[model samples]
Target: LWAFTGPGFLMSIAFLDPGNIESDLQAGAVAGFKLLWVLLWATVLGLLCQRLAARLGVVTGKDLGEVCHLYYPKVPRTVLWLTIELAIVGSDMQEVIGTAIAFNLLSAGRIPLWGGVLITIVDTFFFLFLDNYGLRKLEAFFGLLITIMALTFGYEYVVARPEQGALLRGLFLPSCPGCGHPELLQAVGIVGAIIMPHNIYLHSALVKSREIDRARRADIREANMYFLIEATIALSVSFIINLFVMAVFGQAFYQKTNQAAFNICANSSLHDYAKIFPMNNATVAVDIYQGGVILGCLFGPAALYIWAIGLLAAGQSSTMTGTYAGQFVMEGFLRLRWSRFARVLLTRSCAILPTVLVAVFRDLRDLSGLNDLLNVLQSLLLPFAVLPILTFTSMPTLMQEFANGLLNKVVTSSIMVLVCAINLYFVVSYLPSLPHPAYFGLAALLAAAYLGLSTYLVWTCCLAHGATFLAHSSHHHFLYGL
Candidate 1:
């Protein structure tokens, strides 16, 4: 367990990152405990994907990005690299946003949002310095962060005193009673936020750090089992942490009116932050910033501070992992290496520049709304990672006897088809609101390119799965090494 612990824990952190915490909090606030089952199933699906990723790394001795480099033509491979990099960058922005919010809350609004974002640039380098000490130390550091997150989030759960019966019913039962289109969107958001694209690349790469004798089937089998167990344990802990966030909000914030929240905050010691909650009848929308203030108003200052601490842990830990993903995705797909410092500098600047701009030019509502858009961006790019890993891992020559069995392929492909369909639905849902004909035309063109690339990828995947008749032998001989 110790030998296989680090990678899965690191991978599980993606599930608990700021993007996901926001999703969980939103789920609880909007739908209450009605959506907890979605969180449960989404985590299960993520574990299955991670299981395949670990198996791919263990059996083929290659990360997903490296495998794509070998299997895909240069053009497709480069495009795949860009897509994964976009996912990583999008996630970095969320981390920056979360951390900035955390510092603002921790300082009781003394630090400006832009100032908090600037602080992330310095602290990121400090944490990355842990890498110089070697692997286990870094792993231990991540473990400590995960523990802090658990304690802090768990503290909120205990204080909120959510009903055990309703929480359990929500977890065990799959129904979302009285849910509507908004709830459906939140359900999709929950899935998108939980199962990230770069995480697949990161997990597959992380497993390679362990020593495994691929020439021996017994050893490979043992490695796969251990990694699966570790991932299961890690994801269960993350799921519970997510449950904590969701349950806390569900107990305290469900069905709350913005006017009620505003009134309470206006009367409390945290009255200054009350302006974010408008005086209205609409359901009170909570982002991480207002989440802290509302918790303070309803509970106490201790709850608000602890929530900020947990958000900081979530953001900081995810930032480190995002940097690693950036490095691995760059090095593996492009076959180019940059020093970790240079790489972190590049990704940090890319995410920070735009985020700091938004912080400077916009209000908190707009900045948090940008995170919602970024989560959708991650959902849209998910197919790029999922298709490649599924294609490569299912290839017989590549994985030898460890190739995905018929049952595994069927289940995974079905899941992929379902995910893509949901993605298309998500895109289509946005088209009517695009405002201008020119804008609609641009969106139409981009959508065409997106679907075209996805279709091409699925075609290659079909070829990998023995649909050789789909193309002439001259076209895809490389698929089977003919």
Candidate 2:
């Protein structure tokens, strides 16, 4: 049990990261508790994917990135590396955005967003250096952060005390009865935000840190079961924390207008920050920043600051994990190694430069909106991770007796298909919102390349699953399929 403990918790942190929390808060604020079921099912789907990842690591003694190195041609493998790196960079931006917002709130607006972004650069190195202690110690520290987030967010839940009946209905009943387009888009964001691509790489690698004897089937089975249990518990905690965020906002902010928010906080402890939101009939758009302010207005300053503390924990923990993912993804794809400090520096600079610029040139409003777009970007790149994992894990030669069964393959493939379809819908819906025909044309071309690669991946995957129409022997021979 102890040996199986660390990786699941590490993997689960990705589920509870700031990007996911931002999606949770936005879902609650926009659609109320109507999307709690999405969070639930999405977490379940995330666990399923993580299960395969852990099993792949345990059975094959290789992380997903390493396996991709063996299975894919050089061209596709390099492209896959780039896509996963993009996901990592996108995640880093969200971490920077969330932690900066936390500092701004904790300081009562005294800390500039750019200052917070700059601060992360220093603190990240500090945390990464903690590895000087040992690996398990670092995992324990992350566990502590998860506890802080749980306690802090749980405090908000207790204070808010949302309607029990409606929250249950949202969680168990999958239907979004009265939901429309905005709600649908938020639902898509929830899926994208809930499941991270690089976390799959991270999980597959994390499990490898545990000494496992893969020569015996029984031992492999035991590892799989134990890791699955730990993931279930870890993600269960993550799901509840996510529910707490969603339910609390559902109670306090659903259908609320900016004018209403201004009026509510105008005379309260949050009065100074109330002006950040304009008085208008449009529904209040809640980000991590305004989520804290509104909590202060509705509850008290304690709730507001505690919320920021939780956000800080979320951001800090995710920053470390994102750095690890960057390192693993780079080392695996290119077979190149960089020092941990070097990895943190590269990813941090890539993430912080644009974020700091936004903080300098733009206001808090634009900074928060970047979180939303980044969530969508994560969603768009998800297939790159999912398709390859599904393909490789299903290969008999790769996983031996532990290769995915028909049932597992079908379920995972169906989920990936659904996710890709939603991304396509999201892209089409988002097309009109962009500017200039030239840029639109450029987007069209890039999206075509993206979809083409995904289609090729799916074809390869289908071939693995007995889709033999026009399938050549060379593909299987290259894989050494028995």
Candidate 3:
């Protein structure tokens, strides 16, 4: 139980990691409190689905990757696992850059941002060397960082002192002030950031570490309760932190001060306040609908920290899971063998090398461009992770007594579809606008091909299942004839 308690908290913090902070801030700054409802919805759905994942892990005594190996066909499972690995890498790269940026910000430009990348890599191996106890200590340290972030924003929030009524309205109501296409995009980004695919995979795998016996119904119930409570506390802290960030940003930036001065500060000043106080001859434009000021201020630094940590965590954790999944997928599909560490190292090396190189040599603008590109890639691969989870959980063969009921299926499927659609829209809409049109066009082509491949995988899986059913039926018919 003691061991179980810690990982659940760490797992929960993964959701609040840096990328999420950035997304939350962007949502608040651009759209105000209009999408607060999205956060609420994400929290509810995330908890439910995460609990189910925990249940699945406990029942099967295996992570989602292992289960997929046993249940799914070899070829399709390989493709699915590959897509997940790519997403994990893409997601972690954002963290690597984010951590570097954070160091740059907090250190007042003393530490070369790129240098932080090497530091982070070293930090990862150090954490690994420390073993589970060391990881726990690291998680605790990060949790403290999360607390500092919360308090910092909370203090900023108190200083800013947003209107209570307006904050309440934003939390409860959904509004798009402009109702245009741009606003729509912001809304979608908000949603995407809130309910991330990697978080889902991470949560599923983490929950398995809680050594609960499913055969004992009472123990299963106890495990469920324990996880639920832990998850709720973690998510609640995230919500508060997010809320604080939004409040701070809302107080600071909801109104347009001096555009020229703001631009100057944005370009020239290292400190946040340096850009805010010296403005004149400009009316502050305060919209009653804004709710993300806290988010804006905290997001930049917080994102760097979270992404850095997330990259380290995801790279290490997912490497293990991906390799485990890979071995199964390979054996099941291709009749191949990849030792656990070998597979993990192969995937991790592929992901880590490019990201490290890009960090070291790429310009900041280019790195930013690559980060956006990775977001799009992750967006495209989201459905592959989501769909299989949905299908498998709903399948009686896998879920049995725990299988999703009608409402669960409907809600889960809806969320999955919505996630895939919004991410696809983001990719399509944003990619073309990148600096290099040719690169964007090539990416679009690849995304299309991947989408087609994903569709074929799904179709093949269904076809195989259907054919097996028909074959059994035909055999029964022949027996009757005999």
Candidate 4:
């Protein structure tokens, strides 16, 4: 288990990313203390799915993408690849939006939103450089960023001095009375942002790098257990770090008005950012940037500065992880030699294009809300990655002696069903938010196409499950693969 440490920590970056950081704060800010339960259980669900992912890779000797290539026919495979690439890129934008917001804060007034995006154009390459040294060093660097988050956000946890009783109740009780669509959407967001689909793909591949022997079932099971254990530790840290952000906001900004924030900052060094909070007597809209400003106003300058450092680390750290994930996605494309210029531009482009539009037309809350929904959407999209891997790993012909047992099948299927169900609930709420008939029309068309595609993949998964199911049909034979 000690030998299998690196990749699980790297996979944790999915939770540490900018979209999720903002998602945590939004949960605290919008719903007071209750969403803590949502985040806690949501992260647990993340662990369940990622466990299946690690199991698939360890037993099958193939990552999710390769399995899809071998199993699915060309058209769906290609389309699935392209769509997954798009999902990868869309998530990359959250990092862009987050980094851009960090700069949007640092500049105070002079630099515009797009200016941050322009800097991101090359900054992604800096991370790629770390990989050139070795993947180990890059993983270590992520540890540094995680440390930054711990010290910074952890500092806020101390200063904010939130209601200790309420905090515990939120985490343990799991109820949100008087909470409406706002809290529900944020609840969905917690699920969406934390359990990234890309992380699963990255994990499936990352485990292969650890040099476990493929021939023996004991070695394979040992590797899977270790990976699952490591992933749980990594995500638990992420969950705690996120819990800090949520508790801080839950204490400081939960129900504060713009006027209240303005007064607080006007009397503090945060006066420079005071204008960001209007005096209109309305509740202030807090985004990543504003979240920091409010913190400074409440806890003095150290809190604001530490928050910025944490944001920079969170945003940069996640971009590198995203680029790392993008590399796996790109492998199916071509000769794909690693070039620095190509690395930076290509990685930045996947995240940049949509971020530019988001910067131009959308409100900051829209950006915040998008991260939440995207996480759930990532959940919904889980089958695309998990199913094929599930199929291959479950197949007796493939895994042979290392196939899944009864408990494994039931747990994995439950996660898939849970992910899909929440995603559909979010969709029902989201359709009303679309402004134009044309937009709705496009969504309808896309949904129909997606359904057809999903139908094929689902049936294909049944084929894989069917093989595994029959091999374990009789109670006496249930652990046949074992």
Candidate 5:
């Protein structure tokens, strides 16, 4: 029972990972407290959805993918499963590459970034050698690493104490000091990073490992309360970590003079400058932001290591879960079954190969460009992953007493729609900006393929929904009956 606590902590770390820290830094540097509200909103929504997902798992004794398989028809279930598998892999690739970059940074460029990736692959397999107990230990170790990062940055935040009144105002009263266009995409990325789809499925599935039975009312209530509190504590740590990062950066980079001093101090000594001016304006300005950046650089590599491993774990773990869910759903719904290993390999290979190839062979100069492409792919696929969870959880017939209430459904759906729209915008804006025309064309082709698949998904969902409605309703007569 206590072992189950680790997965939620792992899930929370996914949000506070090094990649997210970088994104947070970028947001603070470029937009300041203006986008703090987005982080606040994302965290609240994340906790709400994650808690509900954990509840769904405990109450139903099924992971989300299995639940979907049970509720939806064969073809729709298969499509959704494949899409999620792809999404998880796509997300993992980013972490892999990000890990590599952090390694490069930490090693002072001594190790080639790609070499770090190879190391990561080996590290992942080494983790696989660990028994479940060992895996839990690794998770605890990573949690400690994250805690240290939080403490370090939290100390930096203290040194560069932001105005409490201003911080509170920014947290509660949202305002974009900059105009609409400059930081919008970044805002979206921060939001996407926070409320990740894989984490939803992973959390839902993880809570089931607690061995809680919903058959007894007391057990069900206890399970729900326990998981919710557990998830809250985990997310609270993540929230504090994020706040610390933002606060550190906000104090360091909020003003233009501070930013300029940061640049100047990058190559000069504060002691020397103090000789010229008693106040040492440049020293004060540069010291704070530079300290944060240096901390980020050091912590960043550790974060990348943890995150890369976590991503690999998430993809491999979720793929296995999805396979089981797929098989169970197939047998239960359509009387079909598949070899689980084969299904997992097929889906994971499809998702992972592209990322690996891009990371290995692509021009280093174009890596950022490739990340942009991956981001778009993630955006397009985000809905496929989110909608299933939202729909199934909201369906009273499917979840019974565990189904989402009106307010829960409304909030979840709103976040779903907002994230989807943001991802769609990312895809639209990023595709044309690709450096190579061929890459742009390829992106366009991919977009077309996605559209076709999306259409098929919609058709299948509509057909299934209609069929279920007709079958369940005795009084309704179809005008054009089949």
Candidate 6:
């Protein structure tokens, strides 16, 4: 059991990343406890996807990227790799935004947002180099970070004293009674935030770090069994932590008007932060910054500071994990060998430039807005990773006796179909908001390209599930070994 402990926990960090904290807090602040069932089920869906990803690695002796390298032709393989990279890079930006905001909060605004963004460039390298000491120690340190988030957020939840009955109803009852468009949007956003695309690649690669003897089928089965159990435990822990953030904001901040929040902060020792909430009747829209500020005004400074600490832990841990995912994806897809330093530098550079420019030039609202948009971007890229994992893990050639059974196929396929439909809804709902009519044609072309790629992947996946006649068609080149 101890032998298989690290990867799943390391993988669970994705669930607690800063992007999730932002989404969770917003969901709570906006809709209160009405969305807890969505959080529970989203984590379950995430776990199922990760289990398939872990099994693919445990059974095939290869990570998802490496499998993509082997099974996909050069062209589609490169395109798939690019889409995953897009997801990775987009995720890195959210981490940067979160870390920057955390530093701003911890320092009480003495540290400028741009300065925090700049500091991330160095601390990332520090942690990456620290991993050189030993892998187990790194996992232990990540555990400590998770504990810090749990304790800190748990303290806040205790302080807020969210009503147990409503919370329970949200958890057990799926219906969002009295909910409207804002609530619906938050529900969809939770699905995007809970299940990240890059985390799939990261988990598959992380499992290979364990010493599993592939020669014996019994050894493989035992390893899979332990990994699944470990993953369930790890994900459950993260789910609770997410619930803490959601419940705290839900209880303390939901439906509180801006003027009311402003009055409370203005009269308190935290008056300096009051200007963030306008003097108006509209309900306060809490991002991470406002979330912390309002906590202080209502609870105490300790709650605010604890929230910052948990946020810092969340951001810092995910930054390192995202870097590792980037390195694995690049190495697996391109077969390129580069030092971790170069990989971190490349990703940080790509993430930091836009981050620093925005942080320096704009206000916190813009930064938080960018984070929300990235959540949508992540949702858009979900199928690229999900489809590939489903296709490969369901194939007999790769998994042999471990290939997805009929029920596994049915369940995973249905999940993918539902996910794709949700993503389409997001796109359509987002379409009318485009600023210009000219962008409509551009969007159409891009959407067509997106569907074209998805259809090609689905075609290959059908071929994997025994559609042999397609091998003689014009699309035969897409088939492996054709």
Greater lDDT among 3 and 6 belongs to 6
lDDT of each: 0.80, 0.80, 0.56, 0.72, 0.57, 0.80
lDDT of 1 by residue, 315-396 (tens): 7667778888888988898998887777777888889999999988987778777887788788888888888888888888
Candidate 3, residue 70: how far the Cα is off, in Å: 1.5
Off by over 4 Å in 5: 1-11, 180-182, 254-293, 296-380, 431-445, 448-482
- List TM-score per model, in order: 0.92, 0.92, 0.74, 0.88, 0.73, 0.92
lDDT of 3 by residue, 1-482 (tens): 46554544555455665555555544454555566666676667667666666666655455666656655555666776667667656655666655565555445457875676666567556644654546557556656666555555566567667777777787778654565555555456545454555555555666667787566577866776777777777677667667766655554555545564355346542345334334574744221111122223334434334433433443344334344444444443344566554544455567668867876776554665465455546555656766656655555565456666778767865776677677767656765557854565776787677878677645533432234534444223211211
lDDT of 5 by residue, 313-356 (tens): 43333333344444443443344566654444444455446656
Give stretches of model 2 more than 4 Å off: 1-14, 125-131, 134-146, 266-270, 274-276, 467-469, 473-476, 479-482
Q: For residues 1-482, could you state the per-residue lDDT of candidate 2 as single tens digits?
A: 56654555555665578887787777787787789888889889988888888888888888987877876788888888888888988998998888888888777688888879868977876766665757557556655766775776677678777888888998999987888777877888889888889989998998888787656789988988998897787788688778887888888887788888888877786567778788778976677878888877877767676667667777767877888888898888889888777777888888888898888898776877788889888888888888878877888786677878889988997889789789978877877777756675776788888978887787778776665566776667534653
**Model 1 lowest lDDT segment of ten:** 5-14
Clashes of 2: 0
User: Model 6: per-residue lDDT, tens digit, 1-482?
Assistant: 56654555655665578888887777887787889999999889988988998898888878998888877778888888888877877778888898788788777789999878767877776756665858557656655866775776687678778899999999988987898766766777888888888888988998877787767799999888888887897788788878877887788777789888878888888767767677779866567888888878877767677677667667767766777888899889999967777767787788888888998999887898788888878887888888889888888777679988899899988988998888777767767788875767877888898899999888888877767654556555434432
Count backbone overlaps in model 6.
0
